[PDB]
Amino acid sequence: DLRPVVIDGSNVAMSHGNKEVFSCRGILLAVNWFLERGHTDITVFVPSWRKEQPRPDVPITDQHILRELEKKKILVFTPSRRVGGKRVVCYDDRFIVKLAFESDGVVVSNDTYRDLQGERQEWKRFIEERLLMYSFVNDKFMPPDDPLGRHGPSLDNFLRK
Ligand code: NA
């Protein structure tokens, strides 16, 4: 029944808590929301530099959650590294999109990826049809019952095949 679920870990962690803080529980909270409904195939994507320790230079909370979810075969780090002077991160976005697209699943994010809509035509289609936004109120992950709006489908149908 249930469509595969690809979450954008950075979109979510940033949303949750302080907007200027990578809040890892946001990620957990999202994952459980899908775990409670019965979903078993969930990928969260997050860049690999988010493991390093510490980045007292980038604010973050409950970092230990990231490896916990990697262990449960849900979180997957995206590649990154330090080239010459600074840093180089393989867009999280392409992994998130590709995966969902190639698994005919859904993407949990409030990013619409207007660049990736623009690059490939087929992807623009997919995002319009299968992005799933949300709001957080404190620790409460609240996705809409009307994900495409009055005219599209009910949330339960959105998560089915
Ligand atoms: Na945050």
Residue numbers in the entry: 134 to 294
Task: Please give sentences taken from the publication describing this entry.
Regnase-1 (also known as Zc3h12a and MCPIP1) is an RNase whose expression level is stimulated by lipopolysaccharides and prevents autoimmune diseases by directly controlling the stability of mRNAs of inflammatory genes such as interleukin (IL)-6, IL-1β, IL-2, and IL-12p404567. Regnase-1 accelerates target mRNA degradation via their 3′-terminal untranslated region (3′UTR), and also degrades its own mRNA8. Regnase-1 is a member of Regnase family and is composed of a PilT N-terminus like (PIN) domain followed by a CCCH-type zinc–finger (ZF) domain, which are conserved among Regnase family members. Our findings suggest that Regnase-1 cleaves its target mRNA by an NTD-activated functional PIN dimer, while the ZF increases RNA affinity in the vicinity of the PIN dimer.
X-ray crystallography was attempted for the fragment containing both the PIN and ZF domains, however, electron density was observed only for the PIN domain, consistent with a previous report on Regnase-1 derived from Homo sapiens. This suggests that the PIN and ZF domains exist independently without interacting with each other. We found that the PIN domain formed a head-to-tail oligomer that was commonly observed in all three crystal forms in spite of the different crystallization conditions. The amino acid sequences corresponding to PIN (residues 134–295) are the two non-identical residues are substituted with similar amino acids. Both the mouse and human PIN domains form head-to-tail oligomers in three distinct crystal forms. In contrast, our gel filtration data, mutational analyses, and NMR spectra all indicate that the PIN domain forms a head-to-tail dimer in solution in a manner similar to the crystal structure. The previously reported crystal structure of the Regnase-1 PIN domain derived from Homo sapiens is nearly identical to the one derived from Mus musculus in this study, with a backbone RMSD of 0.2 Å. The importance of residues W182 and R183 can readily be understood in terms of the monomeric PIN structure as they are located near to the RNase catalytic site; however, the importance of residue K184, which points away from the active site is more easily rationalized in terms of the oligomeric structure, in which the “secondary” chain’s residue K184 is positioned near the “primary” chain’s catalytic site. In contrast, R214 is important for oligomerization of the PIN domain and the “secondary” chain’s residue R214 is also positioned near the “primary” chain’s active site within the dimer interface. Within the crystal structure of the PIN dimer, the Regnase-1 specific basic regions in both the “primary” and “secondary” PINs are located around the catalytic site of the primary PIN. In the absence of target mRNA, the PIN domain forms head-to-tail oligomers at high concentration.
